[PDB]
Swiss-Prot record:
EC number: 3.2.1.17
Keyword Chaperone annotated: no
Known catalytic reactions: Hydrolysis of (1->4)-beta-linkages between N-acetylmuramic acid and N-acetyl-D-glucosamine residues in a peptidoglycan and between N-acetyl-D-glucosamine residues in chitodextrins
Oligomer and partners: Monomer.
GO MF entries: beta-N-acetylglucosaminidase activity; identical protein binding; lysozyme activity
Homology family: Belongs to the glycosyl hydrolase 22 family.
Main location group: secreted
Protein name (database record): Lysozyme C
Disulfide bonds: C6-C127, C30-C115, C64-C80, C76-C94
Source organism of this protein record: Gallus gallus (Chicken)
Function, as annotated: Lysozymes have primarily a bacteriolytic function; those in tissues and body fluids are associated with the monocyte-macrophage system and enhance the activity of immunoagents. Has bacteriolytic activity against M.luteus.
Gene assigned in the entry: LYZ
Additional note from the record: Lysozyme C is capable of both hydrolysis and transglycosylation; it also shows a slight esterase activity. It acts rapidly on both peptide-substituted and unsubstituted peptidoglycan, and slowly on chitin oligosaccharides.
Location relative to the cell: Secreted
Keywords linked to the UniProt accession: Allergen, Antimicrobial, Bacteriolytic enzyme, Disulfide bond, Glycosidase, Hydrolase, Secreted, Signal
Length: 129
């Protein structure tokens, strides 16, 4: 599924991400824009053979099981395929674990490089939320 901007903001708020660990909804929308372009089915292979999955490009090195990332963990206790669903529940639940891990949203390199410190409220501007 390719979400619209305000459609994703609304879904992230319905699943309790807005202001989660102090990160406003615009931070989450911005992260999803640059990680996946709002596409739930986005995948990207990393140089180390891990894969990033879904709207927030969650990595198999730590967070999900894809059977093909040697030495990896599955700390969200999910198949990485669950992160590609039209329903964002598994991505949101796992993202809450990641952003609790100690470095906040810096875990998302694209958030650090393209969202951190910017006018992230622009991402929810105009949205009926
Ligand atoms: Cl957009
Ligand atoms: Cl915001
Ligand atoms: Cl594996
Ligand atoms: Cl594990
Ligand atoms: Cl699995
Ligand atoms: Cl959803
Ligand atoms: Cl933080
Ligand atoms: Na894994």
């Amino acid at each position: 599924k390719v979400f619209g901007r305000c459609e994703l903001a609304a879904a992230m708020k319905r699943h309790g991400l807005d202001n989660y660990r102090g990160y406003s909804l615009g931070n989450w929308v911005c992260a999803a824009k640059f990680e996946s372009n709002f596409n739930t089915q986005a995948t990207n292979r990393n140089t180390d053979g891990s894969t990033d999955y879904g709207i927030l490009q969650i990595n198999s090195r730590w967070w999900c099981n894809d059977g093909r990332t040697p030495g990896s963990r599955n700390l969200c206790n999910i198949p990485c395929s669950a992160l590609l669903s039209s329903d964002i529940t598994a991505s949101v639940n796992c993202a809450k674990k990641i952003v609790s891990d100690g470095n906040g949203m810096n875990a998302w390199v694209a958030w650090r490089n393209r969202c951190k410190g910017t006018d992230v409220q622009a991402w929810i501007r105009g949205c009926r939320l």
